[PDB]
Amino acid sequence: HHWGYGKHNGPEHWHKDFPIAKGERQSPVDIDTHTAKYDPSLKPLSVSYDQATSLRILNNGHAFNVEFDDSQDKAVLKGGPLDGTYRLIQFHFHWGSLDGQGSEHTVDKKKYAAELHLVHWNTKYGDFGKAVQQPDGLAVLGIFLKVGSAKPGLQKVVDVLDSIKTKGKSADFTNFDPRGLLPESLDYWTYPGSLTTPPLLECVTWIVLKEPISVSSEQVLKFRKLNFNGEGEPEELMVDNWRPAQPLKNRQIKASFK
Ligand SMILES: NS(=O)(=O)c1ccc(CNC(=O)N2CCN(c3cc4c(cc3F)c(=O)c(C(=O)O)cn4C3CC3)CC2)cc1
Ligand SMILES: [Zn+2]
């Protein structure tokens, strides 16, 4: 009886195994655009993905992860609110059963169809397992997805999903350039928060881009054909793998832009 996104094991249950679910810096949150303060002391973010080395794509039973070689400083996030150098380890998405839900963060209570998370860890802690134990261990770049025009840079991800339909399946996923998933503007909101899945560790600097990317209905439909279940098990479509907004408590959301 493990955690998930169903009636019996979803977000409202997680606190029983992971009491930090009710903690002081949980994610995601609603971004109230009128309350977020422009912080002129923030920097432009530095997204350096030219040497990124993607390796593999995995269906882990609650999302799919595109994994990178993080054994050297190849794809890094720096600047913005961050001190030091954060290495890209994986990206994944959260999405809905319908276009009107799926994102984890919300903007003035608006839900997007999906949300991309590019996960990076602070090189001063040496490895990801150590970094998640520190309050400044991870930086997650969040990007909203709306449904409209196709995103060309997503299609290589969409076309491999039939090969990882069920939990535990992986496929080779070399030579994928995550620059093709970015919007035009790097304007962002930032706040201190947590992993949005168990173990819900309070180790994340969140950087959420203001500009959504557009994907096509056909692209998100293929996300919704994935399975939470393993091969040969009763089919449970992988949909609604999002945690709802959590209390902001004693936090300030800062804006990079006027
Ligand atoms: N959204 S966020 O950006 O804030 C964010 C959140 C979270 C992270 C860091 N942790 C993760 O990434 N995890 C959590 C653990 N997870 C699981 C893998 C599982 C199982 C259960 C799991 F929960 C099983 O039960 C299972 C089985 O054999 O039954 C096999 N597998 C592994 C894949 C084969 C894998 C992914 C990073 C970033
Ligand atoms: Zn995530």
Side-chain angles (χ1 to χ4, degrees), residues 1-6 8-257:
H1 194 89
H2 67 251
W3 73 263
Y5 297 96
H8 303 282
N9 66 354
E12 70 280 24
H13 294 270
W14 296 347
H15 69 102
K16 290 177 277 171
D17 287 311
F18 304 96
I20 206 179
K22 292 186 170 11
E24 301 300 308
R25 63 171 277 188
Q26 290 290 292
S27 295
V29 298
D30 180 56
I31 302 166
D32 191 82
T33 66
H34 285 108
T35 301
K37 195 168 161 72
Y38 170 64
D39 186 345
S41 81
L42 285 171
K43 311 153 198 315
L45 194 62
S46 177
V47 186
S48 305
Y49 286 175
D50 50 300
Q51 292 293 306
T53 301
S54 67
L55 285 177
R56 193 178 73 138
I57 192 172
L58 171 69
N59 177 333
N60 62 21
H62 58 264
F64 64 85
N65 293 356
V66 174
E67 303 164 348
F68 290 78
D69 174 10
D70 59 349
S71 80
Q72 303 183 258
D73 280 352
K74 289 187 160 182
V76 302
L77 186 64
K78 304 178 317 98
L82 304 174
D83 290 342
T85 299
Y86 292 72
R87 217 174 269 179
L88 178 63
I89 175 162
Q90 53 103 335
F91 71 76
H92 63 271
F93 303 83
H94 305 260
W95 66 87
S97 52
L98 315 159
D99 296 348
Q101 62 187 214
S103 66
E104 293 207 307
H105 294 88
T106 59
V107 179
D108 301 327
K109 297 301 180 72
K110 179 186 167 71
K111 292 176 170 72
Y112 288 85
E115 186 175 331
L116 167 62
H117 291 165
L118 297 133
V119 182
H120 313 73
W121 59 268
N122 195 327
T123 63
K124 78 188 186 101
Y125 299 126
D127 67 65
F128 181 85
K130 285 293 195 281
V132 298
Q133 299 178 58
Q134 310 295 335
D136 60 351
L138 293 192
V140 185
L141 184 61
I143 308 178
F144 298 119
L145 283 59
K146 67 179 184 187
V147 176
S149 298
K151 190 68 163 176
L154 182 64
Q155 189 61 31
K156 275 200 310 195
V157 173
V158 167
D159 280 334
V160 75
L161 297 181
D162 276 336
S163 75
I164 60 154
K165 187 180 173 179
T166 52
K167 178 173 172 188
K169 293 201 65 182
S170 70
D172 299 298
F173 205 67
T174 61
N175 303 288
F176 180 74
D177 190 342
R179 293 181 292 180
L181 299 178
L182 303 177
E184 269 179 24
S185 179
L186 295 183
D187 295 342
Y188 66 88
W189 297 288
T190 184
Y191 76 97
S194 74
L195 302 180
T196 71
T197 65
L200 299 168
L201 297 168
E202 293 182 334
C203 63
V204 183
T205 303
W206 277 97
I207 301 167
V208 176
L209 297 190
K210 175 175 184 187
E211 185 187 336
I213 59 167
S214 289
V215 302
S216 64
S217 189
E218 293 84 1
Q219 286 178 323
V220 274
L221 284 162
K222 282 172 191 188
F223 285 22
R224 300 181 182 132
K225 292 188 196 298
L226 289 164
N227 285 186
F228 284 128
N229 54 281
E231 184 181 5
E233 291 172 5
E235 187 153 8
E236 295 175 306
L237 292 176
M238 184 180 283
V239 296
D240 294 320
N241 61 348
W242 51 279
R243 188 191 194 192
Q246 299 301 309
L248 190 59
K249 294 183 176 184
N250 189 35
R251 291 179 291 179
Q252 275 181 348
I253 308 178
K254 299 302 190 187
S256 72
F257 65 88

